[PDB]
Amino acid sequence: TIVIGLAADSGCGKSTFMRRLTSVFGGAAKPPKGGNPDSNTLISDTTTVICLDDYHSLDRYGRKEQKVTALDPRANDFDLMYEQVKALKNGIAVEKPIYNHVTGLLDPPELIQPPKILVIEGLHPMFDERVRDLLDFSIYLDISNEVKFAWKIQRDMAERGHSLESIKASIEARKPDFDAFIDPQKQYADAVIEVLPTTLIPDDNEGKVLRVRLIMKEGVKYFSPVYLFDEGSTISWIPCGRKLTCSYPGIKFNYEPDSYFDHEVSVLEMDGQFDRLDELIYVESHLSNLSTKFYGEVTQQMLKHADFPGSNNGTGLFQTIVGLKIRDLYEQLIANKAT
Amino acid sequence: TIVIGLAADSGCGKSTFMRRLTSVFGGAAKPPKGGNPDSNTLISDTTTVICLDDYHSLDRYGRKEQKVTALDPRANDFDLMYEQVKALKNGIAVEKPIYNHVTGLLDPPELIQPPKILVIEGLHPMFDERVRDLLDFSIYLDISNEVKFAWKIQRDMAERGHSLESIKASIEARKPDFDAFIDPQKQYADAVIEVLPTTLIPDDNEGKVLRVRLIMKEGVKYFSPVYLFDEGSTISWIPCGRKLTCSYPGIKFNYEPDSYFDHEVSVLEMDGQFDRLDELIYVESHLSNLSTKFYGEVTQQMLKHADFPGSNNGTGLFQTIVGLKIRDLYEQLIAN
């Protein structure tokens, strides 16, 4: 966990995901103080987060000239990505270009010092074999089209597009290269958080109530997947729940082993949204392999960030658990010395 | 004394059910040492089982000629039944008639001494309020009518010979009476074992694999129901596996609260069959409030009678567990 990789698409609350992760690690998540104001980087005393947009080879206007998207590998310089995170992993400060999302250009570099924990997040952290050989853990955030577009209506890119406050051409121009080049990276993730429309009730295009699968890879050295009641078995669990007033659809947990890109995985799934902070502390209490340090830490960490999107559903619950898992992987890896 | 009531239709495994209960409470249960070859009583060290046909008010012919069936409350004497169950509970011996099942006649009575555990088994154990109040715990062995027909067309009298086939008289006899006086007694049981067609393999009604539900009543003083993992929640559970390994039909468990006659119950459901009895000890190791005094006790009981029918499915499993939860109740009452 000296180097983490988070594959996720723009506008999927990866921002919110990054902040839950950082807080478990060291809680600061602030951009560099005196440089470019349009820097994508975040810094804490323990972790530094790098947006892989900064390794675009082609700027916005150049990408248009060649009529390739930010998702094209042609649009991204992977050789430089590889050498730079290889340098950051080995204690070497690096001169990192800055992709300016506002003006669309590749601006003068940022000087990145080598962090205790390095997170590279964006479209291609698992795309290139050389780079994932550097990663000690990898995450993929899978937002299905329905939930993506549902967030893309108001809330996320708030009905601002051009034709019916919809630039929806974007999704239909990006998705070809997205399914060609981004989605196949799921295969290399130790943890996938998959967000889908709810099996419970009829909502969307508002979203809000979600079926969130947490796919965890078995057989990866310091990662024991969380399980519910009996590991290896197939389980449904409706925690209701006298303490539980919840809810309009309620919450239903699911647990089952599965094979995922012909990798054996365990899947924990939560449908619906919880509610009382005394009633999600119930939920934590019946999961195991939460790799927490003390009782209630999942809820503690969730309560701290009680402001956050997805803080009432599996999106925040699983993102918070993934963070604790990765810190476990840290405390292990930071422990392996010395002679 | 502790008095139990076993509501059952015969041909539905009340006999087998019964032998699983007695094994939990005490020794072998055999007819009276001395008199009447065709008695229906069964005595053990601790438990006495009275078949309730012995309280018939009309014999086979009288019942026939008076145009009623065994299930008719008019063909039964609930006063005597009440007075004798009440006497046996209070430690008073009792001159209890005998319905001879071969000849269909009410033989002279037999003297029944009062046991520690009295078990009245038959059609109307909880029909009568005064009888009902004497029961410390009560059981209904329900068979879905879909299963019943399937059990008739293979077990009771499959073909019944002579080219054809089944009897209209058979189903078109007591089915009206059953649903009017028997079936409504489910409301009063603290524990109900309901047996229905299986979800797992689509059949019209084969009858080998079953879906068994054990409906238990919350609120009973000394009765803490069985639960799966997290009491009072709704849970579905396939113990296979991918860790446990099962055969062409899996096993599948369901645990949930429900409303039974507008009474609040917790239901435990087993679907499928235990092919290799290493899944039984797994399943037991995960259930809760089994009223075991030692772990694996349900298992040991089940294999001790491994050729009791229904040992490989939820029938034997739940009847065994019900037996244990009565022994718990038994020991609490005694224990002040």
mmCIF file of N, CA and C in Angstrom, chain A residues 229-242 257 264 282 286, chain B residues 229-243 257 282 286:
data_model
loop_
_atom_site.group_PDB
_atom_site.id
_atom_site.type_symbol
_atom_site.label_atom_id
_atom_site.label_comp_id
_atom_site.label_asym_id
_atom_site.label_seq_id
_atom_site.Cartn_x
_atom_site.Cartn_y
_atom_site.Cartn_z
ATOM 1 N N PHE A 229 -21.682 -13.529 8.359
ATOM 2 C CA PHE A 229 -22.204 -14.719 9.049
ATOM 3 C C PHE A 229 -21.422 -15.999 8.763
ATOM 4 N N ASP A 230 -21.318 -16.422 7.502
ATOM 5 C CA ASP A 230 -20.601 -17.664 7.195
ATOM 6 C C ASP A 230 -19.866 -17.549 5.864
ATOM 7 N N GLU A 231 -18.530 -17.541 5.918
ATOM 8 C CA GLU A 231 -17.714 -17.297 4.732
ATOM 9 C C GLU A 231 -17.795 -18.460 3.752
ATOM 10 N N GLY A 232 -17.883 -18.125 2.469
ATOM 11 C CA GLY A 232 -18.025 -19.114 1.437
ATOM 12 C C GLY A 232 -19.452 -19.441 1.071
ATOM 13 N N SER A 233 -20.410 -19.183 1.962
ATOM 14 C CA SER A 233 -21.806 -19.524 1.726
ATOM 15 C C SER A 233 -22.509 -18.399 0.976
ATOM 16 N N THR A 234 -23.735 -18.669 0.538
ATOM 17 C CA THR A 234 -24.585 -17.679 -0.112
ATOM 18 C C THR A 234 -25.677 -17.249 0.861
ATOM 19 N N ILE A 235 -25.815 -15.939 1.049
ATOM 20 C CA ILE A 235 -26.567 -15.342 2.149
ATOM 21 C C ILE A 235 -27.383 -14.169 1.631
ATOM 22 N N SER A 236 -28.611 -14.049 2.117
ATOM 23 C CA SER A 236 -29.371 -12.807 2.106
ATOM 24 C C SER A 236 -29.601 -12.386 3.552
ATOM 25 N N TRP A 237 -29.589 -11.077 3.804
ATOM 26 C CA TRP A 237 -29.779 -10.607 5.177
ATOM 27 C C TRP A 237 -30.539 -9.292 5.151
ATOM 28 N N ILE A 238 -31.748 -9.301 5.692
ATOM 29 C CA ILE A 238 -32.498 -8.076 5.934
ATOM 30 C C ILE A 238 -32.403 -7.801 7.429
ATOM 31 N N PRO A 239 -31.563 -6.852 7.851
ATOM 32 C CA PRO A 239 -31.272 -6.696 9.282
ATOM 33 C C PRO A 239 -32.446 -6.233 10.132
ATOM 34 N N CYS A 240 -33.632 -5.992 9.556
ATOM 35 C CA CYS A 240 -34.765 -5.493 10.334
ATOM 36 C C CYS A 240 -35.061 -6.413 11.518
ATOM 37 N N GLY A 241 -34.846 -5.897 12.720
ATOM 38 C CA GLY A 241 -34.417 -4.516 12.868
ATOM 39 C C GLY A 241 -35.472 -3.713 13.586
ATOM 40 N N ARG A 242 -35.655 -4.031 14.862
ATOM 41 C CA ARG A 242 -36.559 -3.266 15.710
ATOM 42 C C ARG A 242 -36.004 -1.876 15.955
ATOM 43 N N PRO A 257 -19.905 -16.239 -2.787
ATOM 44 C CA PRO A 257 -18.717 -16.398 -3.627
ATOM 45 C C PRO A 257 -19.109 -16.404 -5.095
ATOM 46 N N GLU A 264 -11.560 -16.171 -8.761
ATOM 47 C CA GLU A 264 -12.468 -16.425 -7.650
ATOM 48 C C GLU A 264 -12.567 -15.177 -6.772
ATOM 49 N N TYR A 282 -25.252 -1.297 14.000
ATOM 50 C CA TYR A 282 -25.746 -2.671 14.018
ATOM 51 C C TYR A 282 -25.161 -3.465 12.857
ATOM 52 N N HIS A 286 -22.266 -7.234 12.604
ATOM 53 C CA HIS A 286 -22.503 -8.583 12.101
ATOM 54 C C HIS A 286 -21.653 -8.937 10.887
ATOM 55 N N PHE B 229 -28.421 -17.266 12.678
ATOM 56 C CA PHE B 229 -27.468 -16.146 12.681
ATOM 57 C C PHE B 229 -27.884 -14.931 13.511
ATOM 58 N N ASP B 230 -28.979 -14.263 13.150
ATOM 59 C CA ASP B 230 -29.341 -12.978 13.756
ATOM 60 C C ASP B 230 -30.843 -12.954 14.048
ATOM 61 N N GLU B 231 -31.216 -13.199 15.314
ATOM 62 C CA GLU B 231 -32.611 -13.449 15.673
ATOM 63 C C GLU B 231 -33.514 -12.283 15.295
ATOM 64 N N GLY B 232 -34.684 -12.613 14.745
ATOM 65 C CA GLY B 232 -35.652 -11.622 14.337
ATOM 66 C C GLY B 232 -35.415 -11.001 12.977
ATOM 67 N N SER B 233 -34.335 -11.359 12.285
ATOM 68 C CA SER B 233 -34.133 -10.848 10.939
ATOM 69 C C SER B 233 -34.674 -11.841 9.916
ATOM 70 N N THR B 234 -34.785 -11.374 8.677
ATOM 71 C CA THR B 234 -35.069 -12.233 7.537
ATOM 72 C C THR B 234 -33.745 -12.662 6.921
ATOM 73 N N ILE B 235 -33.566 -13.970 6.744
ATOM 74 C CA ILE B 235 -32.300 -14.523 6.276
ATOM 75 C C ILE B 235 -32.576 -15.635 5.281
ATOM 76 N N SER B 236 -31.788 -15.672 4.216
ATOM 77 C CA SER B 236 -31.775 -16.780 3.276
ATOM 78 C C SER B 236 -30.368 -17.356 3.262
ATOM 79 N N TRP B 237 -30.255 -18.677 3.148
ATOM 80 C CA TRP B 237 -28.965 -19.319 3.385
ATOM 81 C C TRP B 237 -28.843 -20.585 2.561
ATOM 82 N N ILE B 238 -27.912 -20.599 1.614
ATOM 83 C CA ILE B 238 -27.546 -21.839 0.941
ATOM 84 C C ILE B 238 -26.222 -22.302 1.537
ATOM 85 N N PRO B 239 -26.221 -23.332 2.392
ATOM 86 C CA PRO B 239 -24.974 -23.716 3.078
ATOM 87 C C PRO B 239 -23.920 -24.279 2.152
ATOM 88 N N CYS B 240 -24.310 -24.736 0.971
ATOM 89 C CA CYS B 240 -23.353 -25.076 -0.071
ATOM 90 C C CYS B 240 -23.054 -23.813 -0.875
ATOM 91 N N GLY B 241 -21.808 -23.638 -1.301
ATOM 92 C CA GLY B 241 -20.719 -24.577 -1.131
ATOM 93 C C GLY B 241 -20.364 -25.264 -2.445
ATOM 94 N N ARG B 242 -19.188 -25.043 -3.047
ATOM 95 C CA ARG B 242 -18.170 -24.012 -2.759
ATOM 96 C C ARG B 242 -17.783 -23.814 -1.281
ATOM 97 N N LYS B 243 -17.517 -24.912 -0.575
ATOM 98 C CA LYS B 243 -17.147 -25.038 0.845
ATOM 99 C C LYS B 243 -17.872 -26.197 1.494
ATOM 100 N N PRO B 257 -39.359 -13.524 10.459
ATOM 101 C CA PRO B 257 -40.607 -13.369 11.203
ATOM 102 C C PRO B 257 -41.794 -13.268 10.259
ATOM 103 N N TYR B 282 -22.903 -29.575 9.956
ATOM 104 C CA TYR B 282 -22.688 -28.190 9.561
ATOM 105 C C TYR B 282 -23.917 -27.355 9.884
ATOM 106 N N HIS B 286 -24.540 -24.092 12.977
ATOM 107 C CA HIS B 286 -24.867 -22.696 12.708
ATOM 108 C C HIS B 286 -26.203 -22.234 13.283
#
